[PDB]
Amino acid sequence: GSHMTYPTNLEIIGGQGGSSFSFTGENNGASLEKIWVWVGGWQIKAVRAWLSDGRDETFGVPSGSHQEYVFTPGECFTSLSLWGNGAGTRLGAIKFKTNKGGEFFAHMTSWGLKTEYPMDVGSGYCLGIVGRGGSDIDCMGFMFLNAVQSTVLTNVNYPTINQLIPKVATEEIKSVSFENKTSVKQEQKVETSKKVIKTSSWSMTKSFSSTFSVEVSAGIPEIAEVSTGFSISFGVESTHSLEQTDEKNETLTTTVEVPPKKKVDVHITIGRASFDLPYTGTVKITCKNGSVLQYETKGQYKGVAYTDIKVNTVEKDL
């Protein structure tokens, strides 16, 4: 009496004839983006579906006009019912509603509807359609991702990071000169403060990111100024949000020595690095029921990072 759970929820309605089809984003997390439905007197006649990855297929043989539903990013099912044709030989009707308040109802036109089969839409995120068809839709179901516990982008790599040439803009913070006209040493304390706004973002298809809160477990590109010049490093792995911004007052206290009968110019700056480079990773979806769906992904990472505050001191005679 062991029990198996799955990351998808699929209930197929209709008859036993025709040829099998499966048209879903189980491979890559694509969702149903658009659907056209044709009907006949005693069946759903045909269905054409588009997934968010651009796939486009037709099942059954269209006749007459079609009805359309176009899903916008983030627009999930809230409810779905299917009917057979009452004879156990075809799909008869499709009714659904969405979280944007849309409704869609397509049905056979001669025979009345009998038993309604209301479906659990899981998370509401529809991965596509599975069934059998020939001339008509013999049977079909809508496949949903089950309710999710977590959605994580992990195993993140930046394949070009070690080829990247640092682009670092100088931001001026402050400059001041000191004078020592005596023949003794002087010291001057200089304190510095500067707001820095650090950002990270990993690109993802908007339909997926609109529906799910994606946690990122990744290192990010980092910038420092070192001996020969600027250096880019692949930082240590930590938890981020998909788009993240943090701000801080970065500060420094510097003691400048002023040697006798000399002028000392103090120049205080910081470097601002932009990052714009591709990444690879794995999307791991863990469902409430304990099952997992995962797939490889790629995108673009954009980040802003700052160096440490830098103090440059130049001596003159005077």
Binding positions for its own copies, rule: CB under 8 A:
77-79, 97, 99, 101, 118-124, 146-151, 171-178, 190-193, 195-196, 210-213, 241, 246-249, 251, 253, 287-289
Using alpha carbons only, what angle is made at residue 54 by residues 48 and 57, rounded to the nearest 5 degrees? 25
**Smallest distance, its own copies to C-beta of residue 182, A:** 16
**Does 138 show up as a binding residue in the annotation?**
yes
**Does 303 show up as a binding residue in the annotation?**
no
**CA distances in angstroms from 115 to 81, 87, 141, 226, 308, listed in the order given:** 10, 11, 15, 73, 69
Give Rg (Cα) of the chain. Answer: 31
Minimum CB distance to Cl ion smaller for 90 or for 194: 90
Nearest Cα residue to 155 out of 222, 233, 219, 232:
219
| Nearest-angstrom CA–CA distance, 84 and 113 | 8
Minimum CB distance to its own copies smaller for 164 or for 292: 292
| 112 part of the interface to Cl ion, by CB under 5 A | no
**Does 135 show up as a binding residue in the annotation?**
yes
The number of CA neighbours under 13 Å toward the Cβ of 134 is 8
**Smallest distance, its own copies to C-beta of residue 201, A:** 13
Minimum CB distance to its own copies smaller for 172 or for 296: 172
**Smallest distance, Cl ion to C-beta of residue 83, A:** 7
| 88 part of the interface to Cl ion, by CB under 5 A | yes
**Smallest distance, its own copies to C-beta of residue 230, A:** 20
**Does 291 show up as a binding residue in the annotation?**
no
**Does 60 show up as a binding residue in the annotation?**
no
**Smallest distance, its own copies to C-beta of residue 61, A:** 32
Selection from its own copies, Cl ion, none that 97 binds (CB < 5 to 8 A by kind) is its own copies
Residues in 25-84 at the binding interface with Cl ion, rule: CB under 5 A: 84
| 141 part of the interface to Cl ion, by CB under 5 A | no
Q: In what order do the strands lie in the sheet with 32-39?
A: 56-60, 44-51, 32-39, 67-70
Selection from its own copies, Cl ion, none that 84 binds (CB < 5 to 8 A by kind) is Cl ion
**Smallest distance, its own copies to C-beta of residue 193, A:** 4
Overall residue count recorded for the chain in this entry: 318
Minimum CB distance to its own copies smaller for 212 or for 279: 212
Minimum CB distance to its own copies smaller for 125 or for 275: 125
- Binding site for a mannooligosaccharide derivative, by residue number, is 18, 135-138
Binding site for Cl ion (CB under 5 A): 84, 88
